CSV table of C-alpha atoms and ligand atoms in Angstrom, one decimal:
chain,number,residue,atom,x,y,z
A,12,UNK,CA,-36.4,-18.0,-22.8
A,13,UNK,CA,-39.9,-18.2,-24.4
A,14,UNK,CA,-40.1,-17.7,-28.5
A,15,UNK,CA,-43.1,-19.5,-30.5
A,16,UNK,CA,-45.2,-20.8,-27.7
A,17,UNK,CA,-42.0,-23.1,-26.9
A,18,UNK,CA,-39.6,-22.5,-23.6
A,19,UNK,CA,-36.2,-23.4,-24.9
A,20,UNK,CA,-33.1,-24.7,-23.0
A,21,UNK,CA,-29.0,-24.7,-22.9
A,22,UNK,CA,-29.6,-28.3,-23.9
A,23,UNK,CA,-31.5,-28.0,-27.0
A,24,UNK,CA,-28.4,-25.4,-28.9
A,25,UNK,CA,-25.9,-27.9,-30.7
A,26,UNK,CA,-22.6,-28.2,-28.9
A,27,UNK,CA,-20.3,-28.2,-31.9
A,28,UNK,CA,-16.7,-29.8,-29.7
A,29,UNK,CA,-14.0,-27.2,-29.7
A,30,UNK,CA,-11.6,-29.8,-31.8
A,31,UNK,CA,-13.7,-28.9,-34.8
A,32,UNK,CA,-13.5,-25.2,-34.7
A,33,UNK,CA,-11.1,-23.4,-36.6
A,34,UNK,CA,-10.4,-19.8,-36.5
A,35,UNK,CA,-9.6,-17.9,-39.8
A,36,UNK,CA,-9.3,-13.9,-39.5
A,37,UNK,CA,-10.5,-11.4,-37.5
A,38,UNK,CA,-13.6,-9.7,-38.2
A,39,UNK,CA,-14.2,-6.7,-35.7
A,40,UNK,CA,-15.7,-6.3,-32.3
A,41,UNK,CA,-19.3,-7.2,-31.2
A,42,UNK,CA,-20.8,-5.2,-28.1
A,43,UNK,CA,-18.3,-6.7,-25.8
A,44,UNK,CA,-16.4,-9.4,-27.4
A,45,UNK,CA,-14.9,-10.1,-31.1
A,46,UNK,CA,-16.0,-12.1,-33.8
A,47,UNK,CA,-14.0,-14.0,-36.6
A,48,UNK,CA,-14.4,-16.2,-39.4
A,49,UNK,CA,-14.4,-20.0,-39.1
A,50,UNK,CA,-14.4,-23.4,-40.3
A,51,UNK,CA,-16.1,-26.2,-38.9
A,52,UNK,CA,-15.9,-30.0,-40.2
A,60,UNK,CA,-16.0,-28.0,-44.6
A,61,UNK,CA,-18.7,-25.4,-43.1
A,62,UNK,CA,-17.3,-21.3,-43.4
A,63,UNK,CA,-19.2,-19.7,-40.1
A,64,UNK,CA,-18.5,-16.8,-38.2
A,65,UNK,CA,-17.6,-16.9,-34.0
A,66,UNK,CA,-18.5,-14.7,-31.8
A,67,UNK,CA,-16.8,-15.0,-28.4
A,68,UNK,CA,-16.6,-14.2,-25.3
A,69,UNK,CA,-13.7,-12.7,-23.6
A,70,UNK,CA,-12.2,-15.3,-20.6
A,71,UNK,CA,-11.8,-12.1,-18.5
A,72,UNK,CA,-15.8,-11.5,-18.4
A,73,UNK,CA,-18.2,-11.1,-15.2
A,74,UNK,CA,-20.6,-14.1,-14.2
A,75,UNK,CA,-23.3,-11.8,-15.5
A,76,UNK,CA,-21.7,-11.1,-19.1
A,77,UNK,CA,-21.7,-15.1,-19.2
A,78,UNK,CA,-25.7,-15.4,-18.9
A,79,UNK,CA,-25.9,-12.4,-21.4
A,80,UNK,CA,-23.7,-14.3,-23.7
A,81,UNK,CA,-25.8,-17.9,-23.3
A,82,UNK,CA,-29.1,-16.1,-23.7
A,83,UNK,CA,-28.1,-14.4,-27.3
A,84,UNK,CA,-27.4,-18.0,-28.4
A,85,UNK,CA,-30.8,-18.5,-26.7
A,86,UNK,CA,-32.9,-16.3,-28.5
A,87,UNK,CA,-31.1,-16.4,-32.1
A,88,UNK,CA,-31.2,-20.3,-32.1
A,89,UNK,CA,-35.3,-20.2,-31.9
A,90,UNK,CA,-36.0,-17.7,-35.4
A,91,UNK,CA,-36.3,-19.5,-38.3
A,92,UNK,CA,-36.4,-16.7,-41.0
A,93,UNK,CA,-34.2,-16.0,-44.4
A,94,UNK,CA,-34.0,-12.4,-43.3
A,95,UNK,CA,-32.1,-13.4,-39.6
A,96,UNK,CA,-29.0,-14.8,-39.5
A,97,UNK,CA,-28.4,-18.5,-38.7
A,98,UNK,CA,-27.5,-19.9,-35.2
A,99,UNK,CA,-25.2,-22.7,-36.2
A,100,UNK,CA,-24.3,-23.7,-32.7
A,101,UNK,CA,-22.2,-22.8,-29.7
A,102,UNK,CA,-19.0,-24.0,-28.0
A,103,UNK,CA,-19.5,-23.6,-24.8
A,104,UNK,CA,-18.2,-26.3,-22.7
A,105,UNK,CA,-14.5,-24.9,-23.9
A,106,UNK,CA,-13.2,-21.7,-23.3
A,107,UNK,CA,-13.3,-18.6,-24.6
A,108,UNK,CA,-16.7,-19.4,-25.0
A,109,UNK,CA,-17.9,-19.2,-28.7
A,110,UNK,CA,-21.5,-18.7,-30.9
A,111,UNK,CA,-21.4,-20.2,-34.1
A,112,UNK,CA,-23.4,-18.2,-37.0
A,113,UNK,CA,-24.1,-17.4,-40.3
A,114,UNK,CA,-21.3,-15.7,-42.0
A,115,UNK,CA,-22.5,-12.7,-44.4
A,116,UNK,CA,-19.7,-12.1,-46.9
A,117,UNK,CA,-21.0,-8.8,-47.6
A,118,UNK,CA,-20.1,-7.5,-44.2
A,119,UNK,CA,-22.9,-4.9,-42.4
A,120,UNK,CA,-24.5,-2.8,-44.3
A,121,UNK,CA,-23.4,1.0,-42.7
A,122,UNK,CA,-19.9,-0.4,-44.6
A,123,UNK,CA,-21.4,-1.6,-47.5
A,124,UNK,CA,-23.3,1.4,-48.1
A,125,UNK,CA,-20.3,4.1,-47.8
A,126,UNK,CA,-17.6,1.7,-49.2
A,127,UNK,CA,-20.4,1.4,-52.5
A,128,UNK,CA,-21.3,5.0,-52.4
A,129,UNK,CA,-21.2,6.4,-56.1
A,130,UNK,CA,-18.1,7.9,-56.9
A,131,UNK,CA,-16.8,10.0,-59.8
A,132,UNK,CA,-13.9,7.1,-60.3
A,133,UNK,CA,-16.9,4.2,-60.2
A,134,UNK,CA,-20.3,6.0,-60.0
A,135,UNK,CA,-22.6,3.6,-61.4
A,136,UNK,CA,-22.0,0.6,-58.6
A,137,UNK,CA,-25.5,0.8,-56.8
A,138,UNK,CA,-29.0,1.3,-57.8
A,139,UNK,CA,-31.7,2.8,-55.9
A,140,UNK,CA,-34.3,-0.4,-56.6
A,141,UNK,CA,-30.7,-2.7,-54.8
A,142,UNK,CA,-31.6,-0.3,-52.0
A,143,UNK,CA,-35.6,-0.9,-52.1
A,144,UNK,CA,-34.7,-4.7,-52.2
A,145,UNK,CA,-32.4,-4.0,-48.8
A,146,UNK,CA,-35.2,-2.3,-46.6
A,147,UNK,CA,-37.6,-5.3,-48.0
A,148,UNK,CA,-35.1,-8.1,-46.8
A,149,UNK,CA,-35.1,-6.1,-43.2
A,150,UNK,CA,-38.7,-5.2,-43.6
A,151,UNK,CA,-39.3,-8.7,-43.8
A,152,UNK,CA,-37.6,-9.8,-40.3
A,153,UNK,CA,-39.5,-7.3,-38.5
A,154,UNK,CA,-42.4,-8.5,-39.2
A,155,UNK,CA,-41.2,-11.9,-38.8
A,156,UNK,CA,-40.5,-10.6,-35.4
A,157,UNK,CA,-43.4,-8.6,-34.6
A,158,UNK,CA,-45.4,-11.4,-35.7
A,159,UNK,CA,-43.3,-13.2,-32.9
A,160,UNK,CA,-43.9,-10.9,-30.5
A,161,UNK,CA,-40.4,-10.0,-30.5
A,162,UNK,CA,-39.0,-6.7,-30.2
A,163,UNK,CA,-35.3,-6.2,-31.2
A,164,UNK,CA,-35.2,-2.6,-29.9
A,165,UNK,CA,-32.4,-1.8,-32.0
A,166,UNK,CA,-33.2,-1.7,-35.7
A,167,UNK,CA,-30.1,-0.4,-37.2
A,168,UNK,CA,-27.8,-0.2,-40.5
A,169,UNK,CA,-24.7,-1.2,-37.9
A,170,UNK,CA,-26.5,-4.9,-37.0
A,171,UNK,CA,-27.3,-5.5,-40.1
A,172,UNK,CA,-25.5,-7.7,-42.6
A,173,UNK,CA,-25.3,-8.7,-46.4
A,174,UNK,CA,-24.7,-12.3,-47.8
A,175,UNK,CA,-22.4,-11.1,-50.5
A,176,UNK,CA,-21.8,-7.7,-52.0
A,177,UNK,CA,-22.3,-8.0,-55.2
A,178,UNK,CA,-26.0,-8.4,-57.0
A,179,UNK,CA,-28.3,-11.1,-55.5
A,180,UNK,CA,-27.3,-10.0,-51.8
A,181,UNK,CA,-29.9,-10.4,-49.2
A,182,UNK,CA,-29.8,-8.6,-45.9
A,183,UNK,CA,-30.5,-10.0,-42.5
A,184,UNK,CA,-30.5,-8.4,-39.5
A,185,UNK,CA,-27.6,-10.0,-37.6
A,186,UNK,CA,-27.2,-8.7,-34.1
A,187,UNK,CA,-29.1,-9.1,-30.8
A,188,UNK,CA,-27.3,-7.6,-28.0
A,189,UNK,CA,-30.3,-4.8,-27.2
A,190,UNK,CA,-33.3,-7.6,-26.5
A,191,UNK,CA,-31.1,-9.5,-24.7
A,192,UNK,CA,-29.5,-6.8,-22.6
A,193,UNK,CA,-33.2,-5.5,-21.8
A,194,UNK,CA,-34.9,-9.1,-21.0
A,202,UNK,CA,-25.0,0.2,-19.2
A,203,UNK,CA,-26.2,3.8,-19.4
A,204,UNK,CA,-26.9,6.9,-21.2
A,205,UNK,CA,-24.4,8.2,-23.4
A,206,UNK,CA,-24.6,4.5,-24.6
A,207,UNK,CA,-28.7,4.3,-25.6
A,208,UNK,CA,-28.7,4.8,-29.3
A,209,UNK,CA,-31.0,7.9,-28.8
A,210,UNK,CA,-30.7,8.9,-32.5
A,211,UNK,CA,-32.8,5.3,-33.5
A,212,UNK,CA,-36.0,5.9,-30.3
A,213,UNK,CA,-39.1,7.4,-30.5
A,214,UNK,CA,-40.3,9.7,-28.1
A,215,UNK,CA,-41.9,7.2,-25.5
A,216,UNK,CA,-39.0,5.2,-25.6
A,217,UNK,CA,-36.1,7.7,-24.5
A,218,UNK,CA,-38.9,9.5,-22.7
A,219,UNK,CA,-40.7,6.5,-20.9
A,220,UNK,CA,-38.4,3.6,-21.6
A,221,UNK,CA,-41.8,2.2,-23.1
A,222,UNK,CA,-40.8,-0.4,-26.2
A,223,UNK,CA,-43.4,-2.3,-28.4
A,224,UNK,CA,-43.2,-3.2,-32.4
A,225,UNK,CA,-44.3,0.3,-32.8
A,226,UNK,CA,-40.7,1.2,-30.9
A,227,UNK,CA,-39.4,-1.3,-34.2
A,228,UNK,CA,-41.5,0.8,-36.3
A,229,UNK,CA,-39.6,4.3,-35.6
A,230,UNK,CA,-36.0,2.6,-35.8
A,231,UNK,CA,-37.2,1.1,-38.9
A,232,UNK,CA,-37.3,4.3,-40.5
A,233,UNK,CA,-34.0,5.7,-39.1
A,234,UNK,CA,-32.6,2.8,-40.9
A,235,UNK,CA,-34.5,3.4,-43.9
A,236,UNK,CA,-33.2,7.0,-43.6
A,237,UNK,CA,-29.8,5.2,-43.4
A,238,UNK,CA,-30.1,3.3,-46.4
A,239,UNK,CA,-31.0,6.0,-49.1
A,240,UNK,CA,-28.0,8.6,-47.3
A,241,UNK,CA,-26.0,5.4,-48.1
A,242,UNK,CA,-24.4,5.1,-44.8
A,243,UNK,CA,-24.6,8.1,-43.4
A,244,UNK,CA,-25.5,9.2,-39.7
A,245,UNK,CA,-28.4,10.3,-38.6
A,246,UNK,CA,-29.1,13.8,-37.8
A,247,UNK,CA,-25.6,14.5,-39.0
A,248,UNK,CA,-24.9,17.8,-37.2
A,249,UNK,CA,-26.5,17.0,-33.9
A,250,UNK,CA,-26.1,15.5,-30.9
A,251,UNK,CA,-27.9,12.9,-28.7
A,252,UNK,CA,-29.6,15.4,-26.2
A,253,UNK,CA,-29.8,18.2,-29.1
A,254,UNK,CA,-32.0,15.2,-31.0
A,255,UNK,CA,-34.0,14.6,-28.0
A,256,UNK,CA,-35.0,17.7,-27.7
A,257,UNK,CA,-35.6,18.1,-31.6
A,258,UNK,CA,-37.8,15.3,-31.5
A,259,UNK,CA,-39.8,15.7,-29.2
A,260,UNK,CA,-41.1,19.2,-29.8
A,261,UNK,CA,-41.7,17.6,-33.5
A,262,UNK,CA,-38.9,17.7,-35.4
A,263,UNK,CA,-37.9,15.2,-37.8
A,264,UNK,CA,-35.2,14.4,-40.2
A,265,UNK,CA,-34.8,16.1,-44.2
A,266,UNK,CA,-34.8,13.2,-47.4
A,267,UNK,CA,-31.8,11.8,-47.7
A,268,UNK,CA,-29.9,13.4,-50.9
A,269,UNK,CA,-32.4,12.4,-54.3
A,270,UNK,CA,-34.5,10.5,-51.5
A,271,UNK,CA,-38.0,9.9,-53.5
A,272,UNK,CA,-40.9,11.2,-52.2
A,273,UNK,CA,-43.0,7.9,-52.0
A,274,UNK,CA,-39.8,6.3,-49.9
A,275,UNK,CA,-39.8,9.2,-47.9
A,276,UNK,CA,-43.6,9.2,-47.1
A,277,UNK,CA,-42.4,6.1,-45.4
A,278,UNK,CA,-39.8,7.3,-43.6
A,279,UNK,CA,-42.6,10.2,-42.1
A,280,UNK,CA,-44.9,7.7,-41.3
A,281,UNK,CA,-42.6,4.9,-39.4
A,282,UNK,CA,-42.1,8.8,-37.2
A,283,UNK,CA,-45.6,9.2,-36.3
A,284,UNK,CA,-45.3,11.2,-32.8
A,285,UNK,CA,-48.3,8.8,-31.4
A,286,UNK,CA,-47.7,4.7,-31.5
A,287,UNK,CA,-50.8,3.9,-32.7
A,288,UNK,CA,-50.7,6.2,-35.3
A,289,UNK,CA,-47.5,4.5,-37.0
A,290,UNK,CA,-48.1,1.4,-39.5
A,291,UNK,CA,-46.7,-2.2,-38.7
A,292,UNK,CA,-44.5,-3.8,-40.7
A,293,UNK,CA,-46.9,-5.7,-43.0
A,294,UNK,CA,-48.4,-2.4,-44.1
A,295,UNK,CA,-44.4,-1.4,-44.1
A,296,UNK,CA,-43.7,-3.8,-46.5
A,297,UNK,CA,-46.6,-3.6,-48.7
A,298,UNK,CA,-45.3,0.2,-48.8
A,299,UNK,CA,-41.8,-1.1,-50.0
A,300,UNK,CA,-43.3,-3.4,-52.3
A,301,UNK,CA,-45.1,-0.3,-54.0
A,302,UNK,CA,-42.1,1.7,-54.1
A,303,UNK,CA,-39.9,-0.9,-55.9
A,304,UNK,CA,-42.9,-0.8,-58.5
A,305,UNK,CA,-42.8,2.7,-59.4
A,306,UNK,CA,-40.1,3.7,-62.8
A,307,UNK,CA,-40.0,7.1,-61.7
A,308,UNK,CA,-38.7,5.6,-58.0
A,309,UNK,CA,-36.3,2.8,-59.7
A,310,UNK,CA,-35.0,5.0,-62.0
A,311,UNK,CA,-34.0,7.8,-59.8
A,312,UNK,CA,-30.3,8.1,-59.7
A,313,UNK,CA,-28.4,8.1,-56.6
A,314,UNK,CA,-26.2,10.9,-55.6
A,315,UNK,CA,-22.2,10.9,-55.8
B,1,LIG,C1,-22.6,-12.8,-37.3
B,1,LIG,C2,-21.8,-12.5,-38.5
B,1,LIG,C3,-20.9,-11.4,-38.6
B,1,LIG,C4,-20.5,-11.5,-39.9
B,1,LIG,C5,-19.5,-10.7,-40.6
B,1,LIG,C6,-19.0,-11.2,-41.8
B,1,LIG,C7,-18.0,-10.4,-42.5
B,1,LIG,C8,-17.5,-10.9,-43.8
B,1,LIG,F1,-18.0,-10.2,-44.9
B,1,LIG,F2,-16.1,-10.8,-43.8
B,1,LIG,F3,-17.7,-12.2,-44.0
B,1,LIG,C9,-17.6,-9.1,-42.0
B,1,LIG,C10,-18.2,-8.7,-40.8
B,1,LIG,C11,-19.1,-9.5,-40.1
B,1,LIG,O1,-19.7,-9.0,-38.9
B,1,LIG,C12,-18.8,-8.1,-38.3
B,1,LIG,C13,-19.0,-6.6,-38.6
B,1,LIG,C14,-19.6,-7.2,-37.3
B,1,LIG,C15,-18.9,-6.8,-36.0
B,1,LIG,N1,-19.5,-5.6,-35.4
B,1,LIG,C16,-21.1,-7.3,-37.3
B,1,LIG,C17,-21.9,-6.3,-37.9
B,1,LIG,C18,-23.2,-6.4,-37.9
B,1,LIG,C19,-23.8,-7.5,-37.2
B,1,LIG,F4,-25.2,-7.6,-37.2
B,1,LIG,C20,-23.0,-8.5,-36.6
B,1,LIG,C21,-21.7,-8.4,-36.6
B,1,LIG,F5,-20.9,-9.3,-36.0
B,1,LIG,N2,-21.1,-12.5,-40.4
B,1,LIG,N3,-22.0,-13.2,-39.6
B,2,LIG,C1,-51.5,3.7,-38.5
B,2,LIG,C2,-50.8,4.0,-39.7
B,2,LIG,C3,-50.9,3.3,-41.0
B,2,LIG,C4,-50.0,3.9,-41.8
B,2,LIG,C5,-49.7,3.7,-43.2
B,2,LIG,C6,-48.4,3.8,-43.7
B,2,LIG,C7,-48.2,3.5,-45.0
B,2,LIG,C8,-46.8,3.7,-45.5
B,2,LIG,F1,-46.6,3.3,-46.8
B,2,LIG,F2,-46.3,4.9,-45.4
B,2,LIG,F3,-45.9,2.8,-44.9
B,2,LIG,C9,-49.2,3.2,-45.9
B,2,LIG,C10,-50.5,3.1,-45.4
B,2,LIG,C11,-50.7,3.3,-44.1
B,2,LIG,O1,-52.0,3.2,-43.5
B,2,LIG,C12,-53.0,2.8,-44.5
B,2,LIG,C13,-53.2,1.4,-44.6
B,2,LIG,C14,-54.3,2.3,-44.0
B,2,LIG,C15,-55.5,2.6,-44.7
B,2,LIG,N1,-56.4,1.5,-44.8
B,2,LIG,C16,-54.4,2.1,-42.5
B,2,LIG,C17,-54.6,0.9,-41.9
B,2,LIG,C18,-54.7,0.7,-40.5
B,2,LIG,C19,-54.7,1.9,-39.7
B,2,LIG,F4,-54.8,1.7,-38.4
B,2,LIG,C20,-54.5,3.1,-40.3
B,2,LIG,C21,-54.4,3.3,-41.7
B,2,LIG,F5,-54.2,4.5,-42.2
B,2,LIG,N2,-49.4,4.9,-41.0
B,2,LIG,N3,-49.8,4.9,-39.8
C-alpha cells in the first residue's frame, strides 16, 4: 500500500500481544466481522475482528484496512492504535468514539415534543465541517474513500464539544460482492454508470451525507428504491431540502450534485461553503424540525 509518497508494510503496524487485550461489550457488526470495546495496558479502544471462519482473501482484506488507516494522520479520521494479529481471531485496534455513528446519533437526538430542544442546527454545520475536513485531508492525499456516508461515520462523545471522524474503510479497500449491495443511493452518475470514482465521486456522496445530516438521520430518497433512484438520477433528478433545510446549506447540497465532475467543487471550496454557512444568524438560528 502506497499513502504519502511512502510504501508501508505489515511490519511497520504495532503488534499490541494478545495478553494485553481485553474485551469489554459488544458494539455491532462491521461489513463482515464485529467490533467491541476494549482495554489495553489503561487505554479504552475499540476491536474490530475478524471471524476465525474467514476465506484467505477476507484475511488480506482485513490486513490491508489496518494498512491504509494506520498511514492518515488527521483529527477528523479515526486512530489506528494497532493490530493483533499474530493471535487469533485476528483484531484492529482503534479509536473508540463514545458518541457511536452518527445515522444513530442523529435519530436517537432528533427533537422531540418530550425533549425538543437537544440539537442545534449550527452542532449540525460543525458535523459536516469535521467530515468536510477529512475529505479534503483525503483528496489532498489522493485518496478516495468511495463511500462517504452518515453509517461510517462516528462521534467522540454525544454531548457538546463532539467531533466527527469518518471511521470506516471497507469500500477503498474492497476496490484496491455485487449489486444489490453498491450503495447506489450515495454515486453519481459515472460511478453506477461507468464504475468511474475520483474526489469528485467523494464530492456527490458528500452531499448525500450532508442531505443526511440536516434530515437528522433519515434515508435518502425515502420512498424509492435503488434502480427507481438510478433512473431518477440520471435523467436529472435530485433530492428535496431536508425539513427547515436552509437555502445556503442546500445550495451546497445542489452543487456537491452537479451532473458533470468537473462542474462539482472540491472539498476546500466545500468547506469554505460550510465555514460561510456556520456564519450566517438567519442559518444558525433556524430551528430544527420535531
Ligand atoms: C472504530 C470504532 C467504532 C466505534 C464505536 C463506538 C461506540 C461507542 F459509542 F459505544 F463507544 C459505538 C459504536 C461504534 O462503532 C460501531 C457502530 C459501528 C459498527 N457498524 C461503526 C459505525 C461507524 C463506523 F465508522 C465504524 C463502526 F465500527 N468506535 N470506534
Ligand atoms: C466547479 C464548482 C465550484 C463550485 C462551487 C460550490 C460552492 C458551494 F458553496 F456550493 F459549495 C461555492 C463556490 C463554488 O465555485 C465558486 C468558487 C468558484 C468561483 N471562483 C469556482 C472556483 C473554481 C471553479 F472551477 C468553478 C467555480 F465556480 N461548484 N462547482
Amino acid at each position: 500500500y502506497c499513502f504519502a509518497g511512502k510504501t508501508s508494510s505489515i511490519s511497520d503496524l504495532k503488534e499490541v500481544p494478545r495478553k494485553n487485550i481485553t474485551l469489554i461489550r459488544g458494539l455491532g457488526h462491521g461489513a463482515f466481522g464485529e467490533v467491541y470495546e476494549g482495554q489495553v495496558s489503561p487505554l479504552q479502544v475499540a476491536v474490530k475482528t475478524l471471524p476465525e471462519v474467514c476465506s484467505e482473501q477476507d484475511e488480506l482484506d482485513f490486513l490491508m484496512e489496518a494498512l491504509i488507516i494506520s498511514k492518515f494522520n488527521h483529527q477528523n479520521i479515526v486512530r489506528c492504535i494497532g493490530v493483533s494479529l499474530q493471535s487469533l481471531p485476528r483484531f484492529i485496534l482503534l479509536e473508540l468514539m463514545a458518541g457511536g455513528d452518527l445515522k444513530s446519533f442523529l435519530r436517537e437526538t432528533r427533537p422531540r415534543p418530550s425533549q425538543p430542544s437537544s440539537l442545534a442546527m449550527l452542532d449540525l454545520l460543525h458535523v459536516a465541517r469535521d467530515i468536510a475536513c477529512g475529505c479534503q485531508y483525503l483528496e489532498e492525499n489522493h485518496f478516495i474513500h468511495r463511500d462517504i456516508a452518515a453509517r461510517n461515520c462516528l462521534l467522540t462523545c454525544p454531548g457538546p464539544g463532539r467531533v466527527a471522524k469518518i471511521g470506516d474503510f471497507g469500500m477503498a479497500r474492497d476496490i484496491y460482492g455485487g449489486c444489490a449491495m453498491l450503495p447506489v443511493k450515495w454515486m453519481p452518475p459515472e460511478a453506477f454508470m461507468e464504475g468511474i470514482f475520483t474526489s469528485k465521486t467523494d464530492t456527490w456522496s458528500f452531499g448525500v451525507l450532508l442531505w443526511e445530516i440536516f434530515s437528522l438521520g433519515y434515508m435518502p430518497y425515502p420512498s424509492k428504491s435503488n434502480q427507481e433512484v438510478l433512473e431518477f438520477v440520471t435523467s436529472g433528478g435530485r433530492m428535496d431540502p431536508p425539513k427547515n433545510c436552509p437555502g445556503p446549506v442546500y445550495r451546497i447540497m445542489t452543487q456537491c450534485w452537479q451532473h458533470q465532475p468537473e462542474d462539482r467543487p472540491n472539498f476546500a471550496i466545500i468547506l469554505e461553503r460550510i465555514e460561510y454557512c456556520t456564519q450566517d444568524p438567519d442559518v444558525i438560528n433556524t430551528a430544527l424540525p420535531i
